Amino acid sequence: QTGGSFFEPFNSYNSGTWEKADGYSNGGVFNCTWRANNVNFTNDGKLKLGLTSSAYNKFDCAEYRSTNIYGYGLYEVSMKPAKNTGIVSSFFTYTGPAHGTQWDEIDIEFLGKDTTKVQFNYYTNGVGGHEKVISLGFDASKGFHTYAFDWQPGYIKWYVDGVLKHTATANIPSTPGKIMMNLWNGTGVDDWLGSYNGANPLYAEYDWVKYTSN
């Protein structure tokens, strides 16, 4: 059925790949407008997503999304999140009503508030609440480390620097989704994220992405 294996080095933009979110806010708990102009590719070949103030307590943030959808297989990122309260840095897979399907996502989240920790979650058809905070013995934000999840029909495995950190066993997502990375600040969730203190510009770097199909 879907999208085949690729390897993204982030030195050449080309069509039918990836698209940026621009000029709209996801609302609720994302307290920033997505700006296409906050997705910058560097000359050494790393996507650089940023969080910036447009106006005083008015912030803009950054999202990148694959045009195609991807299934079952191995997902790999080399990435450096932003450390700072009240923010998230992620790489996930997503589909939603938004796309005309059941909301299916698996994810890796770096809560800027603690980047010596990662949050593993997934959502099958709206039900999520499967969050696993693992403690990586380093600061994710002092450098580039590889983060994989093996999405399968029976389990989801998660790997930090080739080390198995978490497996998921009950009700695993089964709709193909887009690969999505972003940097956003939140409202309401002071509890989960901490409070964003207004500090900017913040940025998460993504060195490369690889999806290996089965």
Ligand SMILES: *CCCCO[C@@H]1O[C@H](CO)[C@@H](O[C@@H]2O[C@H](CO)[C@@H](O)[C@H](O)[C@H]2O)[C@H](O)[C@H]1O
């Ligand atoms: C799982 C926790 C992190 C993000 O959750 C989901 O993020 C999606 C992308 O940021 C978002 O879906 C997008 O919403 C916009 C606004 O309607 C659409 O343009 C896009 O098609 C859709 O994927 C979800 O809102 C959220 O659950």
Ligand SMILES: [Ca+2]
């Ligand atoms: Ca690159």
